[PDB]
Structure 1
Amino acid sequence: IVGGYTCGANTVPYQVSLNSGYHFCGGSLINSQWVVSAAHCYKSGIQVRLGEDNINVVEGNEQFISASKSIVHPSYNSNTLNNDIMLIKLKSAASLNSRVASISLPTSCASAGTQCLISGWGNTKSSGTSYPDVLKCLKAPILSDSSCKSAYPGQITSNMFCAGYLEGGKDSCQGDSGGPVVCSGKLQGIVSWGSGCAQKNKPGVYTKVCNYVSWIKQTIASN
């Protein structure tokens, strides 16, 4: 997260860190046994770390659980990143509490101008790599479809939306992929891509979760 602030330990209880010997992507806890992340974060050997704040120090409240299966969306296109969503089932359920809690799925999509909270342990520099130890947060608004398409002509599908600042300086970045975009207490987006990080006129692009609610419910139900 570039231009964000320290969230404060466990203030984002649905945030998870996907770890393969190091933090590589974020995700969101949607129930005690399932996490939603981005399909481009897929790999085997994933350990899901819940209740984290400082990813380099065990401070308490952490729960490390291996992933049992990862289900990448069948129509995921790695070239366009269309349908960049994946579900991870945990080997055992997490113990939910105030520090580890699930976030609700939306019932309607959000409108442009809705303010949302984006968080993660991704790069904090738009020029160079600087990965923080603790969780960073950023408040960003959803942009209109015309501004999004003007910014990324021919690259935005109906399963994506832009959120951010056209003036640059504040944005999600590499390492934040797979993490949550929460607006009014509902998970509306998944950090997916962008051109560089926090560059002027190049806002972040997110997977539009409201278009996948039925798929998520059907898939969880049958697995």
Structure 2
Amino acid sequence: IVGGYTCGANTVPYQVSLNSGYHFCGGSLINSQWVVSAAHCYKSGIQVRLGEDNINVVEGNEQFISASKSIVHPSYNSNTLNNDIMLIKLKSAASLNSRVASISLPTSCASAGTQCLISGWGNTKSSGTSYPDVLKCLKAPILSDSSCKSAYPGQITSNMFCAGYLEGGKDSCQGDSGGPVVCSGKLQGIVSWGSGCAQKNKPGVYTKVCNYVSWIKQTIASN
């Protein structure tokens, strides 16, 4: 997260870190057994880390649970990042509490102009590299479809939306990938891609979760 703020320990209790020996992506806990992340975050041997604030220090509220299954969207295309969504099943159910909690899936898509909460442990520099210890947060508005397509001509599908600031300086970034965009208390986006981070006229691009609720529900009911 570039240009954001320190969330506060466990104030984003659905935020997970995906660890394969190191933090590499975020994700969102949607019930005690399932995490939503980006398909581009797929790899084998994922351990899901819940209840994290400082990802480098055991502070006492973490739950570390291995992934038992990862399901990449059937139509995921890594070249275009269309359908950049994956489900991760936990080997055992998380214990839900005040610091580890699920985020609701949307019943309707979110609206342009709504301020959403984006969070993660990704790079905090728009040029160069600096990674935070504690979870970072950014409030950013959903941009109009037309402005999103104007920023990324030929690259925005109906399964993507833009959020952020055309002036630059505030954005998600690498390492936030797979993490949540929460609007009005619902998971509406997944950190997906962008040109650089926090660059002028290049806002963040996010997977449009509301298009995937039927697939999520069917998949969870069968796995």
- Give the drift of 1:115: 0.6
- Give the drift of 1:36: 0.2
* Partners of 2:73 and 2:129 in 1: CA distance: 30
* Partners of 2:109 and 2:125 in 1: CA distance: 31
* Partners of 1:20 and 1:55 in 2: CA distance: 13
* Partners of 1:191 and 1:60 in 2: CA distance: 27
1:137-173 alpha-carbon deviations (Å, 9 max, x no partner): 0000000000000000010000000000000000000
- Give the drift of 1:57: 0.2
* Partners of 1:152 and 1:87 in 2: CA distance: 27
- Give the drift of 1:199: 0.1
Counterpart of 2:80 in structure 1 is 80
SS of corresponding position for 1:13: coil
SS of corresponding position for 2:137: strand
- Give the drift of 1:111: 1.0
User: Gaps (5+ residues) in structure 1?
Assistant: none
* Partners of 1:15 and 1:111 in 2: CA distance: 22
- Give the drift of 1:129: 1.1
Is 1:16 the counterpart of 2:16? The answer is yes
TM-score computed with the length of structure 1 as normaliser:
1.00
SS of corresponding position for 1:28: strand
* Partners of 1:137 and 1:201 in 2: CA distance: 21
* Partners of 1:164 and 1:220 in 2: CA distance: 31
- Flag as ranges the 4+ runs of structure 1 deviating above 3 A: none
1:8-33 alpha-carbon deviations (Å, 9 max, x no partner): 00000000000001000000000000
Counterpart of 2:145 in structure 1 is 145
* Partners of 2:110 and 2:65 in 1: CA distance: 32
* Partners of 2:153 and 2:111 in 1: CA distance: 20
The number of residue pairs the alignment matches comes to 223
SS of corresponding position for 1:191: strand
- Give the drift of 1:54: 0.1
* Partners of 1:183 and 1:157 in 2: CA distance: 20
